[PDB]
């Protein structure tokens, strides 16, 4: 005869029990459910008929055996109440009273918590628009008053993201991640005189330190990823701006340096997240540590993508650019899109595949800034092609899955990915005259 060994757990209204079962699977469930009830229960609520269900899906048709319904040996099945019809929707003869009755059936009753959300969002908007208006006043009129306004806003929001870490955690993280804007503005405008490398160096240093300490706090593990992203981005732009400050360097050098940093950060997300991880409980914080490790991976991946696209726009927004620069940009883009195959998180893959889209958009805005409108139209054309690829992959999942492709094709994909993320190096060495630095000194 046929039998099947499946594990079942009763959920119920009390802490259930997971057990194995050796059930014969040739006969309707209705003949075996009482067996499961006898097994997993330790044996009125207006009783309900109980039936097996896939651990995530909806209950089985109660007349279908475990062969004519998707079940394999060793599967996990849950014990759910069979679906039943909703109670007959009450009918209210009047209209106005019917309106007031049927509206409150799902409405949130405005209370203090709505006022709290409103005030938090209002304060966030104030932080943003105050930074914006003050920094505009600074750069435009130079009256040195916007300087004071933004400095005060930065101090206040930092003190605020430090003070409220016991009254609400969300305020802490939210005001910190917004403070990332006014401290950036205050430090970028805080170096006197002309604009250049020192301003961006100070701003990157400030945002790096602020993200570092705010991630040291961590009342909500939601803002870990954002602070990691901004910390690593700040470190990257800090190194680059320190370079461009100590000794003058061209745009191509900055571009290739930033793209290289992005490549290294992306390909070393494992190592970087590893070093980032820095009455009785034994591995009871494992959910927290795992969630934070995922957060750190997503953050540093986002920072890699951002550094890559920043360097690309840097050495991809110049009216004159060697086609080697175009190769660097496009190869970095394809390298990100192809490294998106190695991770297993939706938020890491999203960033790696959005490198290409973000690059298209950033090139678009950059070309629109300069007088290059014809270049912007072509960037927009490439954007259209890219979203077309997105759509075509979304409509036909046969393309989307990796099991459609045989292992030789997958290994060829891997070889191409390594080839691109490698060959970015000598072409970078050729774009900037690094060989000239040794041949002719």
């Amino acid at each position: 005869m046929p039998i099947v060994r499946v594990a079942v757990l009763a959920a119920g209204d009390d802490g259930g029990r997971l057990t194995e079962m050796a059930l014969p699977s040739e006969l309707p469930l209705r003949e075996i459910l009482p067996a499961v009830q006898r097994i997993v229960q330790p044996a009125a609520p207006n009783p309900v008929r109980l039936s097996l269900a896939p651990i995530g899906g909806a209950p089985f048709s109660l007349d279908a055996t475990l062969d004519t319904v998707g079940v394999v040996d060793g599967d996990l099945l849950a014990l759910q109440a069979v679906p039943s019809g909703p109670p007959a929707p009450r009918i209210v003869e009047d209209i106005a009273d019917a309106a007031v009755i049927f509206s409150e059936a799902r409405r949130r009753q405005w209370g203090p918590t709505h006022i709290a959300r409103g005030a938090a969002l209002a304060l966030i908007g104030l932080i943003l628009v105050g930074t914006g208006l003050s920094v505009a006043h600074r750069v435009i009129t130079g009256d040195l008053l916007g300087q004071f306004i933004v400095s005060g806003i930065a101090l206040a929001t930092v003190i605020a993201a430090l003070a409220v870490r016991n009254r609400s955690a969300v305020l802490a993280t939210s005001l910190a991640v917004t403070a990332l804007v006014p401290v950036a503005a205050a430090f970028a405008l805080g170096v006197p005189g002309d604009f250049g490398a020192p301003n961006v160096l100070l701003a990157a240093a400030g945002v790096a330190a602020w993200s570092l300490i705010s991630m040291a706090g961590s009342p909500d593990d939601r803002g870990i990823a954002v602070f990691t992203a901004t910390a690593v981005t700040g470190v990257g732009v800090l190194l680059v701006a320190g370079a461009a400050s100590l000794w003058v360097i061209s745009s191509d050098v900055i571009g290739c340096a930033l793209v290289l940093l992005g490549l290294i950060v992306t390909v070393q997300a494992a190592q970087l997240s590893a070093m980032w991880a820095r009455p009785l409980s034994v591995l009871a914080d494992l959910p927290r540590r795992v969630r934070v490790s995922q957060a750190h991976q997503t953050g540093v991946i986002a920072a890699g993508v951002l550094l890559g696209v920043a360097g690309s726009v840097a050495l991809v927004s110049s009216a004159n650019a060697s086609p080697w620069a175009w190769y660097i940009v496009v190869a970095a883009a394809a390298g990100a899109a192809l490294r998106a195959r190695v991770w297993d998180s939706a938020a890491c893959k999203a960033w790696l595949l959005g490198h290409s889209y973000l690059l298209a958009v950033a090139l678009l805005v950059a070309f629109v800034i300069g007088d290059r409108y014809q270049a912007a139209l072509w960037a927009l054309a490439a954007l259209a092609v890219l979203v077309l690829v997105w759509i075509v992959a979304a409509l036909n999942p046969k393309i989307a899955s990796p099991d459609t492709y045989s292992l030789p094709m997958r290994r060829m994909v891997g070889f191409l990915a390594t080839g691109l993320d490698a060959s970015l190096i000598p072409v970078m060495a050729l774009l900037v005259g690094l060989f000239s630095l040794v041949l002719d000194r």
Binding site: P34, V82, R90, D94, D97
Partner: protein
Amino acid sequence: ADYLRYLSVVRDNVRAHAAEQRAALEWSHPEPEVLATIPGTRRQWERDPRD
């Protein structure tokens, strides 16, 4: 306005009466798919000639 408020609250009251009656009738007459869980329970043959 007074009459219609009174009418709304008496509508709510009679709807409570109706839902009570319906809950009683559903306690007595469950759906047939429920009947498989009745036997071997304190309620298995409950109706007696006073009900």
